Amino acid sequence: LSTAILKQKNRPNRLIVDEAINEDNSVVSLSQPKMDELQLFRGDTVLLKGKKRREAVCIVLSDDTCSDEKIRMNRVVRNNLRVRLGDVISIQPCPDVKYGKRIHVLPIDDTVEGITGNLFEVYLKPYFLEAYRPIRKGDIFLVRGGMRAVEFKVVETDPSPYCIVAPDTVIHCEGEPIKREDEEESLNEVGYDDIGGCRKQLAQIKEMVELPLRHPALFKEIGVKPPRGILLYGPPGTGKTLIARAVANETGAFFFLINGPEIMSKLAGESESNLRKAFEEAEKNAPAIIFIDELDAIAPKREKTHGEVERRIVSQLLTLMDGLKQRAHVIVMAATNRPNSIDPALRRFGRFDREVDIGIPDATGRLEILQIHTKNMKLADDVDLEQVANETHGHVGADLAALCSEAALQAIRKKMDLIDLEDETIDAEVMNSLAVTMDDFRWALSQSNPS
Amino acid sequence: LSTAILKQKNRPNRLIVDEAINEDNSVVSLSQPKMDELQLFRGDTVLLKGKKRREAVCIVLSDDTCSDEKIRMNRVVRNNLRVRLGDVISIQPCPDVKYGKRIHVLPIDDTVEGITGNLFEVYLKPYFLEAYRPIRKGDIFLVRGGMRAVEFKVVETDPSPYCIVAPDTVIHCEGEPIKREDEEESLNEVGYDDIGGCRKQLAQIKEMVELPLRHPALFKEIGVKPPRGILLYGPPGTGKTLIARAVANETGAFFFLINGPEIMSKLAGESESNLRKAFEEAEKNAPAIIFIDELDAIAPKREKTHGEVERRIVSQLLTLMDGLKQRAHVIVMAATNRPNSIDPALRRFGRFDREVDIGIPDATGRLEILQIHTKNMKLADDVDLEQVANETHGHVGADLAALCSEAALQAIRKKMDLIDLEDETIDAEVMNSLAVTMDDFRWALSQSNPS
Numbered sequence: 001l002s003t004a005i006l007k008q009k010n011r012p013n014r015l016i017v018d019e020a021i022n023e024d025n026s027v028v029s030l031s032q033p034k035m036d037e038l039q040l041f042r043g044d045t046v047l048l049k050g051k052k053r054r055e056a057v058c059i060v061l062s063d064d065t066c067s068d069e070k071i072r073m074n075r076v077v078r079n080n081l082r083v084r085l086g087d088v089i090s091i092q093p094c095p096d097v098k099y100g101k102r103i104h105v106l107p108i109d110d111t112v113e114g115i116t117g118n119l120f121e122v123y124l125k126p127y128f129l130e131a132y133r134p135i136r137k138g139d140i141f142l143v144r145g146g147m148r149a150v151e152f153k154v155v156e157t158d159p160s161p162y163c164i165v166a167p168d169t170v171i172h173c174e175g176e177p178i179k180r181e182d183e184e185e186s187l188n189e190v191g192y193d194d195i196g197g198c199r200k201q202l203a204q205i206k207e208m209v210e211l212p213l214r215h216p217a218l219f220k221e222i223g224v225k226p227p228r229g230i231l232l233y234g235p236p237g238t239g240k241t242l243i244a245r246a247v248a249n250e251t252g253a254f255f256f257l258i259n260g261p262e263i264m265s266k267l268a269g270e271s272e273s274n275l276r277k278a279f280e281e282a283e284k285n286a287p288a289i290i291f292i293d294e295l296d297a298i299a300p301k302r303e304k305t306h307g308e309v310e311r312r313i314v315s316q317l318l319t320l321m322d323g324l325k326q327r328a329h330v331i332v333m334a335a336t337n338r339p340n341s342i343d344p345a346l347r348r349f350g351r352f353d354r355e356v357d358i359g360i361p362d363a364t365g366r367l368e369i370l371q372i373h374t375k376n377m378k379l380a381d382d383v384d385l386e387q388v389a390n391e392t393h394g395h396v397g398a399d400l401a402a403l404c405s406e407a408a409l410q411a412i413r414k415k416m417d418l419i420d421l422e423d424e425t426i427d428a429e430v431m432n433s434l435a436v437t438m439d440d441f442r443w444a445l446s447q448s449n450p451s
Numbered sequence: 452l453s454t455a456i457l458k459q460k461n462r463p464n465r466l467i468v469d470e471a472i473n474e475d476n477s478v479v480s481l482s483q484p485k486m487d488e489l490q491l492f493r494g495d496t497v498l499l500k501g502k503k504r505r506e507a508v509c510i511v512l513s514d515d516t517c518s519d520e521k522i523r524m525n526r527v528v529r530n531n532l533r534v535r536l537g538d539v540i541s542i543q544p545c546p547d548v549k550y551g552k553r554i555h556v557l558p559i560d561d562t563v564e565g566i567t568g569n570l571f572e573v574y575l576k577p578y579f580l581e582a583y584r585p586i587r588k589g590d591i592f593l594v595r596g597g598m599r600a601v602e603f604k605v606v607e608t609d610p611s612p613y614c615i616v617a618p619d620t621v622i623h624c625e626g627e628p629i630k631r632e633d634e635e636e637s638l639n640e641v642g643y644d645d646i647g648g649c650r651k652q653l654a655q656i657k658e659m660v661e662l663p664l665r666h667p668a669l670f671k672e673i674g675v676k677p678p679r680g681i682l683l684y685g686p687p688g689t690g691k692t693l694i695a696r697a698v699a700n701e702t703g704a705f706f707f708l709i710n711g712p713e714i715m716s717k718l719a720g721e722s723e724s725n726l727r728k729a730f731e732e733a734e735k736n737a738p739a740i741i742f743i744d745e746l747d748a749i750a751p752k753r754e755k756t757h758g759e760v761e762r763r764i765v766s767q768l769l770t771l772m773d774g775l776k777q778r779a780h781v782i783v784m785a786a787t788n789r790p791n792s793i794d795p796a797l798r799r800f801g802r803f804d805r806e807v808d809i810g811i812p813d814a815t816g817r818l819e820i821l822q823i824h825t826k827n828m829k830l831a832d833d834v835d836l837e838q839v840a841n842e843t844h845g846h847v848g849a850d851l852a853a854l855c856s857e858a859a860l861q862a863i864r865k866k867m868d869l870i871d872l873e874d875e876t877i878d879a880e881v882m883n884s885l886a887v888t889m890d891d892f893r894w895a896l897s898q899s900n901p902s
């Protein structure tokens with residue numbers, strides 16, 4: 001009703017992700033009845049939009065067994081789009097794709113332990129030979145070559161970001177293997193889906209930041225000026241910084257982050273430069289979102305604050321906030337867990353003149369969060385999160401995370417007589433046996449604390 | 452039960468140290484029934500792991516008189532491994548040992564007072580001649596040559612850290628004699644064993660620092676992120692810094708120590724360089740443990756703190772804590788006796804978000820400590836430590852240490868009419884007669900104080 005901006009719409013080319021029949025990386029299945037509706041001929045190269053602004057490039061074919069409003073893609077494609085089966089994507093005609101000049105690709109470290117021989121020969125040459133594949137920068141794809149299957153990451157393409165791999169395309173694969181861990185962290189980067197029990201506020205954020213920038217005309221037409229300062233506040237640890245993350249990854253805009261404690265670590269005047277530098281960067285690349293985390297760290301009450309350089313910054317900022325022209329298309333967001341200690345001049349109209357309170361979550365919120373956290377954890381069947389949810393009164397997002405981390409340990413703890421700290425490697429059986437029992441949770445629960 | 456990580460395991464090659472029959476430095480005795488179990492042929496050169504990450508290299512032979520799960524080594528070997536008879540070690544096959552190019556070895560100062568003649572000729576040449584001995588860098592070994600026995604330290608080896616001493620090996624022994632005192636301090640470097648009444652906490656430390664680094668996969672598998680900030684706290688003098696020591700010596704990781712009072716002694720900005728420098732060093736050499744002692748000295752409440760450079764450091768630190776990437780493999784440990792005065796921003800989730808309280812010890816703890824302290828003291832038979840333990844309620848580690856020191860003096864005091872301060876040297880008889888009587892303790896006890 002006021003969460004309207006969130007419920008996404010039934011549209012011609014929003015299709016649910018179904019498991020692939022055809023097993024190929026560059027292939028996507030569609031119903032014939034649909035392919036026509038979207039004016040898409042066979043073997044056309046298409047553009048796919050996923051989550052957290054991820055993009056994939058594929059070739060399209062008709063599947064008899066595929067529902068109209070569904071689409072098939074393999075796990076490699078589901079990965080580049082950052083979607084689980086059952087999610088929904090944008091399909092778009094990608095007509096002006098140009099042939100590939102040169103591409104640089106590296107293998108992942110934990111997929112090359114063993115023989116080198118020749119990676120191009122054994123793996124890449126065949127996978128690409130006479131294929132004419134579409135690929136995007138930052139694609140991770142798998143190639144099987146006889147005995148092994150190896151994962152490669154598209155480091156660079158000419159032309160960026162996408163090109164077709166033709167016979168003329170020079171393929172460079174020399175370099176240091178990509179580290180798995182880095183690409184783990186990359187998958188794990190935060191989306192909107194990763195924040196729980198904030199639907200109401202998430203709504204407001206999109207309504208005040210995402211909307212005014214994506215469709216500035218709605219405000220033009222209706223004849224009102226969007227607000228340009230949004231201040232999130234909340235009792236410590238309620239995913240304020242966490243949202244800061246989501247937005248960065250999820251936004252359409254050029255995003256610039258400012259960390260109060262990090263600004264204040266700089267030499268006198270060296271911070272003022274950075275403050276301007278940020279606001280200048282944001283204008284230069286507008287539409288933009290500047291985000292200030294731990295605002296209170298740089299904006300205490302000028303009256304009540306002791307150091308001299310220290311007031312200069314509050315003044316410095318105020319000036320910039322005010323120095324934002326109408327035509328600028330910049331929304332300044334910021335966040336604190338101590339709103340009341342921030343200099344009131346900054347909460348005056350035309351500055352940070354909108355607040356989004358990010359409070360304690362209620363019973364169902366906790367349940368939401370608990371789900372989001374455990375989504376990649378090994379849990380026993382006997383684990384009831386609804387129970388946890390109910391028993392965790394007054395916990396916040398960070399309290400819950402801690403809880404999970406604690407039970408996980410307790411679980412690891414129950415294997416601690418079987419294992420010695422000293423051992424070079426761990427018995428591979430036990431490793432697989434490891435899971436968080438509901439009992440583990442009850443222990444963690446018995447240990448929990450105020451926010 | 453939750454101290455599980457501590458109880459070490461029965462394993463194929465954990466053997467108890469029994470006194471040697473064969474008296475040679477490079478020799479280790481094993482039961483034949485065992486030697487087979489571990490696929491170890493006679494005259495094979497093995498690797499031995501002791502305490503505080505000490506290592507020894509030997510040649511292995513079968514002893515008929517030696518128990519299966521026992522091993523014989525001389526005191527010279529017991530010394531390089533830093534173990535008393537009755538302790539337990541790792542034995543490991545060391546197959547790829549290379550022949551020695553060049554070795555540099557110096558004698559100990561208090562073992563060479565007298566004739567030089569030629570140390571290589573009299574001592575080293577024969578001890579090594581046609582022997583083909585395995586040696587490690589930092590081994591201390593004893594050589595008898597006619598009238599005297601002399602101790603040598605392995606200063607350098609090529610190749611480091613171990614090599615076999617063949618006839619081709621060039622042996623250099625020129626230089627300044629090693630000072631006994633330094634090597635006394637080296638033996639004395641604190642282990643885990645040296646801390647008493649903290650089993651519960653010791654457990655947590657290994658569980659949060661040692662474990663996440665030695666076996667990062669247990670967390671990977673179970674799908675949870677280990678915490679990266681551990682804050683020890685306790686009433687003054689409870690072996691917080693003492694544990695800082697143990698961990699350094701005992702850990703597998705690269706260890707970097709930061710002393711709050713020492714950071715704060717630096718010029719403005721000179722500290723900020725050191726702070727970064729430390730965090731950079733730790734990343735460069737990961738996995739690593741950064742330890743901050745007397746944290747409260749550098750992290751007072753920014754709000755409540757007066758100097759300007761002073762806040763800049765809290766900000767400076769916070770930034771770095773946060774600037775730690777996931778792939779970094781660094782755990783920041785720190786310690787204070789005044790937790791409540793530390794800026795709360797540092798105890799937020801993802802910073803110092805785990806605490807280990809290092810409280811007063813109970814009756815048995817005191818007894819533990821008293822034992823650890825007196826382990827190298829001259830005590831009369833009439834001395835009952837259980838008594839002391841019971842009578843010392845409310846003492847902490849440092850209180851107990853003081854007590855011992857005080858009684859020791861009282862003992863020295865009882866010789867003070869026999870001795871005059873003026874004398875150039877002390878009557879050698881009385882020296883040997885000196886011991887701490889239980890009465891001495893009762894005096895020290897009568898003088899004791901709150902923590």
Ligand SMILES: Nc1ncnc2c1ncn2[C@@H]1O[C@H](COP(=O)(O)OP(=O)(O)OP(O)(O)=S)[C@@H](O)[C@H]1O
Nearest residue numbers: 195196236237238239240241242337397398401799
């Ligand atoms: N609403 C939430 N949904 C899911 N996870 C959360 C939520 N809130 C907190 N968490 C977890 O707790 C961690 C800390 O959250 P942050 O966003 O850093 O807290 P914060 O609100 O910024 O705290 P302050 O005010 O800076 S002390 C996050 O990395 C999440 O893992």
Ligand SMILES: Nc1ncnc2c1ncn2[C@@H]1O[C@H](COP(=O)(O)OP(=O)(O)OP(O)(O)=S)[C@@H](O)[C@H]1O
Nearest residue numbers: 646647687688689690691692693788820848849852
């Ligand atoms: N748990 C303990 N076990 C054995 N000895 C201890 C213990 N605690 C203290 N001691 C002795 O007392 C000395 C002082 O201990 P420290 O570790 O320096 O105290 P601390 O807890 O760091 O005190 P603060 O907080 O810096 S005043 C150590 O060098 C030990 O000799």
Ligand SMILES: [Mg+2]
Nearest residue numbers: 240241293294
């Ligand atoms: Mg935050």
Ligand SMILES: [Mg+2]
Nearest residue numbers: 691692744745
């Ligand atoms: Mg100390």
